[PDB]
Amino acid sequence: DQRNEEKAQREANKKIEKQLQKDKQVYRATHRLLLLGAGESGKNTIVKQMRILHSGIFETKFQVDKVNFHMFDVGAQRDERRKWIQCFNDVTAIIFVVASSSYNMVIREDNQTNRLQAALKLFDSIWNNKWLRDTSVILFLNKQDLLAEKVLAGKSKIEDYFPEFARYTTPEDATPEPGEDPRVTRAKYFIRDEFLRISTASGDGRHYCYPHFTCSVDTENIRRVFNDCRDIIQRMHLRQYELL
Amino acid sequence: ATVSLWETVQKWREYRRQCQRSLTEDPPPATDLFCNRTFDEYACWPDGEPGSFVNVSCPWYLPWASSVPQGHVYRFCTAEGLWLQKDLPWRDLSECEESKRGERSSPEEQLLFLYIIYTVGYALSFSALVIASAILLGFRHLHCTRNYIHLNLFASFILRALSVFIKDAALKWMYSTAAQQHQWDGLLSYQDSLSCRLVFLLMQYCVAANYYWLLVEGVYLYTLLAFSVFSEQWIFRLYVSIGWGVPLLFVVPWGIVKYLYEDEGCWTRNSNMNYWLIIRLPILFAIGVNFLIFVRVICIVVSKLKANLMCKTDIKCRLAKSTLTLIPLLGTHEVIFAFVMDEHARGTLRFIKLFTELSFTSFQGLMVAILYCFVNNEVQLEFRKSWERWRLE
Amino acid sequence: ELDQLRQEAEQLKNQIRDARKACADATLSQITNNIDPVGRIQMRTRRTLRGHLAKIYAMHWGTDSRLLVSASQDGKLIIWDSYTTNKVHAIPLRSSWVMTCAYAPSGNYVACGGLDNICSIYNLKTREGNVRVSRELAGHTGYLSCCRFLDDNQIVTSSGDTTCALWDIETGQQTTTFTGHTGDVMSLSLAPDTRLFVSGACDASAKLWDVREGMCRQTFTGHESDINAICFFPNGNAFATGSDDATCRLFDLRADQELMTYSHDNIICGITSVSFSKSGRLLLAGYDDFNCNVWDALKADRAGVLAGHDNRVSCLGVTDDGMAVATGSWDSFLKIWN
Amino acid sequence: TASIAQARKLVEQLKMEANIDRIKVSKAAADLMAYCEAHAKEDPLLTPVPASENPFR
Ligand SMILES: N#Cc1ccc(COc2cccc(C3CCN(Cc4nc5ccc(C(=O)O)cc5n4C[C@@H]4CCO4)CC3)n2)c(F)c1
Across the interface, which of B224, B231, B326 has its CB nearest the CB of A25? Answer: B231
| Ligand 1 center from residue B348 Cα (angstroms) | 8
Q: Indicate the length of chain D as a whole number.
A: 57
Closest CA to C114 of C135, C91, C137: C137
Burial (Cβ within 10 Å: 0-12, 13-18, ≥19) of residue B192: middle
Q: Which residues are A95's β-sheet partners?
A: A35, A138
Distance, in Å, from the CA atom of B372 to the CA atom of C14, rounded to the nearest integer, reads 65
DSSP strand pairing (B72-76 vs B53-57): antiparallel
CA neighbours within 13 Å on the CB side: how many for B173?
A: 24
DSSP state, residue C42 = -
Chains contacting D with at least 3 CB pairs below 8 Å?
C
> A12 and C160 in contact by Cβ < 8 A?
no
Q: Do chains D and A touch (3 or more CB pairs under 8 A)?
A: no
Which among C6, C31, C32 is the nearest to D7, CB-wise? C6
B376 touches chain A (CB under 8 A): yes
Residues near A120 by Cβ (< 8 Å), separated by ≥ 6?
A: A194, A195, A198
Q: Rounded to an integer, what distance in angstroms lies between the CA atom of residue B71 and that of residue C331?
A: 85
Which candidate, C227, C133, C213, places its Cα nearest to that of C178? C213
DSSP H or E stretch at residue C21: helix C2-22
Q: Do C53 and A23 touch (CB under 8 A)?
A: yes
Q: How far apart are CA B381 and CA B359, in angstroms?
A: 34
CA A29/CA C49 separation, integer angstroms: 25
Contact C16 D18 (CB under 8 A): yes
Ligand 1 atom with the shortest distance to the CA of B179: 7
Q: Taking the CA atoms of chain A, what radius of gyration do you get in angstroms?
A: 22
CB contact (8 A) between residue D33 and residue C24? no
List Cβ neighbours of C103 (8 Å cut-off, separation of 6 or more). C60, C61, C62, C63, C67, C68, C69, C109, C110, C149
Under 8 Å between Cβ of B305 and B319? yes
CATH of C2-337, one of 3.30.465.10, 1.20.1440.230, 3.60.15.10, 2.130.10.10: 2.130.10.10
Chain A residue whose CA is closest to B321:
A243
Is there a contact between D22 and C20 if contact means CB atoms under 8 Å apart? yes
Which residues are B5's β-sheet partners? Answer: none
d(CA C50, CA B8): 67
CA distance A118 to A108: 12
Q: What is the 3-state secondary structure (H, E, C) of A154-202?
A: CCCCCCCCCHHHHHCCCCCCCCCCCCCCHHHHHHHHHHHHHHHHHHHHH
Count of domains forming chain A:
1
Inside any domain, residue A27: no
Cβ within 8 Å, pair A57-C116: yes
| Pairing relationship of beta strands A136-141 and A93-98 according to DSSP bridges | parallel
Q: Which residues of C touch D49 (CB under 8 A)?
A: 323
Q: How far is C57 from chain A (nearest CA, A)?
A: 10
- Whether the Cβ atoms of residue C290 and residue B388 lie closer than 8 Å to each other: no
Q: What are phi and psi of C71, to 5 degrees?
A: -110, 130
Residue of C240, C263, C264, C262 lying closest to C250 (CA atoms): C240
> Of the candidates C86, C99, C115, which has its C-beta nearest A74's C-beta?
C115
Question: Which ranges constitute the DSSP H helices of chain B?
Answer: 5-25, 107-138, 145-170, 184-191, 194-225, 232-245, 248-260, 277-307, 312-324, 327-330, 336-339, 348-361, 364-369, 377-392
Burial class of residue B257 (count of CB atoms within 10 Å of its CB; 0-12, 13-18, 19+):
middle
DSSP-based three-state secondary structure for B260 = helix
Question: Are A235 and B304 within 8 A, CB to CB?
Answer: yes
Q: Which of C26, C235, C297 sits opposite D25 (nearest CB)?
A: C26
Q: Are B374 and B136 in contact (CB under 8 A)?
A: no
C291-296/A93-98 β-pairing: unpaired
C196-201 and C205-210: which strand pairing? antiparallel
Helix (H) or strand (E) holding B33: none
C135 CA: distance to closest CA in chain D (Å): 33
User: DSSP character for B50?
Assistant: T
Chain D CB contacts of C13 below 8 Å: 14
Helix (H) or strand (E) holding B59: none
DSSP state of C191: -
Q: Following DSSP, what letter does each residue of B270-312 receive, concatenated?
A: PSSS--THHHHHHHHHHHHHHHHHHHHHHHHHHHHHHHS---H
For residue B266, the one-letter residue type is C
- Decide if B225 and A234 are in contact by the 8 Å CB cutoff: yes
With the C-alpha atoms ordered B99, B100, B106, B109, is the resulting torsion angle positive or negative? positive
Task: Give the integer Cα–Cα distance in Å for B229 and B212.
Answer: 22
**DSSP-based three-state secondary structure for B159:** helix
Secondary structure (DSSP) of chain A: -HHHHHHHHHHHHHHHHHHHHHTHHHHSSEEEEEEEE-TTSSHHHHHHHHHHT----EEEEEEETTEEEEEEE----SS--TTTSGGGTT-SEEEEEE-GGGTT-BSTTSTT-BHHHHHHHHHHHHHT-GGGSS-EEEEEE--HHHHHHHHTTSTT--STTSGGGGG----TT--PPTT--HHHHHHHHHHHHHHHHHHHHH-SSS--B--B---TT-STHHHHHHHHHHHHHHHHHHHHTT--
Contacts of B76 (CB under 8 A, 6+ apart): B52, B53, B54, B83, B84, B90
Report the distance separating Cα B70 and Cα B344, nearest Å. 34
Q: Do A209 and A193 touch, CB atoms closer than 8 A?
A: no
Chain A nearest-CA residue for B325:
A243
What total number of domains does chain D contain? 1
Residue of B190, B194, B200, B201 best suited for mutating to test ligand 1, as the one with most atoms within 8 Å of CB:
B200
* Cβ count within 10 A of residue A244: 19
Angle at C143 between CA C139 and CA C144, to 5 degrees: 75
Q: Which residues line ligand 1 (CB under 6 A)?
A: B 4-6, 9, 108, 111, 171, 173, 176-177, 187-188, 191, 196, 200, 266, 268, 348, 350-351, 354
Residue to mutate among B147, B297, B304, B332, with most A CBs inside 10 A, is: B304
Of A200, A223, A201, A197, whose CA–CA distance to A212 is shortest?
A: A223
Q: Nearest residue CA, atom 30 of ligand 1? A: B351
* Among candidate residues C145, C243, C231, the one with its CA nearest the CA of residue C185: C145
CB distance C253 to C218 below 8 Å? yes
Q: What are phi and psi of B296, to 5 degrees?
A: -60, -45
Rounded Cα gap, residues B378 and B135, in angstroms: 11
Torsion over CA: A108, A111, A114, A115 (sign): negative
B44-47: long-range contacts (C-beta < 8 A, 24 or more apart)?
Answer: B44/B15, B44/B19, B45/B75, B46/B22
- CB-based contact A120:A198 (threshold 8 Å): yes
**Nearest CA to C216 among B275, B253, D20?**
D20
Using an 8 Å Cβ cutoff, are A122 and A79 in contact?
no
**Count of Cβ atoms closer than 10 Å to residue A240 Cβ:** 16
Q: Are strands A93-98 and A30-37 parallel, antiparallel or unpaired?
A: parallel
DSSP assignments along C81-109, one per residue? ETTT--EEEEEE-SSS-EEEEEE-TTSSE
Are B145 and B236 in contact, with CB atoms under 8 Å apart? yes
| Resolution value in angstroms | 2.9
Rounded Cα distance, B319 and A238, in Å: 12
Find the domain containing D10 and state its range: 1-57
Query: What are the strands of the beta sheet with C205-210, ordered from one edge?
Result: C185-190, C196-201, C205-210, C216-221
CA distance C264 to chain A (A): 22
Distance CA B184, CA B197 (A): 18
Domain encompassing residue A92: 33-240
Q: A242 vs B60, B228, B305, CA distance in Å?
A: 61, 20, 13
Closest ligand 1 atom to the C-alpha of B204?
27
Give the distance from residue C178's alpha carbon to the nearest chain A alpha carbon, in angstroms.
Answer: 19
**CA atoms of C47 and C83, how far apart (whole Å):** 8
C99 in Cβ contact with C228 (< 8 Å): no
Q: How many CB pairs under 8 A join C and D?
A: 151
* Domain presence at residue A18: no
Residue B336: count of CB within 10 angstroms of its CB = 11
Cα B354 to middle of ligand 1, angstroms: 11
Task: Output Rg (C-alpha) for chain B, integer angstroms.
Answer: 29
Phi and psi at C266, nearest 5°, equal -85, 15
Distance spanning both ends of chain B, measured CA to CA: 65
> Which residue of A15, A77, A78 is the best one to mutate when testing the C interface, meaning the one whose CB has the most C CBs within 10 A?
A78
> What is the Cα–Cα distance from A16 to C88, expressed in whole angstroms?
8
The single-letter DSSP state of residue B372 is I
Mapped onto helix, strand or coil, the DSSP state of residue B357 is helix
B352 C-alpha to ligand 1 centroid (Å): 10
- With contact defined as beta carbons under 8 Å apart, do C80 and C88 qualify? yes
Q: CATH code at A91?
A: 3.40.50.300
Q: Is B269 helix (H, G, I), strand (E, B) or coil?
A: coil
Q: How far is the CA of B156 from the centre of ligand 1 (A)?
A: 24
CB contact under 8 A, C115 and A24: no
Write out the DSSP string of C270-321.
PP-EEEE-SSS-EEEEE-SSSEEEEEETTT--EEEEEE--SS-EEEEEE-SS
Give the CA count within 13 Å in the CB-facing half-sphere of A167. 4
In the beta sheet, which residues pair with residue C229?
C242
**CA atoms of A12 and A142, how far apart (whole Å):** 52
Other CB atoms closer than 10 Å to residue B144's CB: what's the count? Answer: 12
- CB proximity C203 to A under 8 Å: no
* Cα distance between residue A98 and residue A199, in whole Å: 15
| Distance to chain D for C256, nearest Cα, Å | 6
User: For residues B58 and B46, what is the distance between their CA atoms, to the nearest angstrom?
Assistant: 13
Measured distance CA(C101)–CA(C98) in Å, rounded: 8
Closest residue, chain C, to B392 (C-alpha): C305
Q: D47-54 — which CB contacts under 8 Å span 24+ positions?
A: D49/C323, D54/C323, D54/C338
First and final C-alpha spacing in chain C: 59
In angstroms, the Cα distances linking B187 to A119, B39, B196, C164 are 84, 18, 11, 92
Neighbouring chains of B at 3+ CB pairs under 8 Å are A, C
Residue C23: which of D14, D24, D36 has the nearest Cβ? D24
Residues 198-217, chain C, touching D (beta carbon < 8 A): 215-217
The Cα diameter of chain D in Å comes to 71
Q: After which residues is chain C broken (C to N over 2.5 A)?
A: none
Q: Who contacts D5 (Cβ-Cβ below 8 Å, separation ≥6)?
A: none
Contact B9, B55 (CB under 8 A): no
> How many other CB atoms are there within 10 angstroms of residue B86's CB atom?
8
What SS3 string covers B85-146?
Answer: CCCCCCEECCCCCCCCCCCCCCHHHHHHHHHHHHHHHHHHHHHHHHHHHHHHHHCCCCCCHH
Contact C177, C208 (CB under 8 A): no
Given a contact cutoff of 8 angstroms between Cβ atoms, the answer to whether B217 and B149 are in contact is yes
DSSP letter (8 states) at residue B176: G
Length of chain A, in residues: 244
- B346 Cα: distance to centroid of ligand 1 (angstroms): 11
Beta carbons of D29 and C28 less than 8 angstroms apart? yes
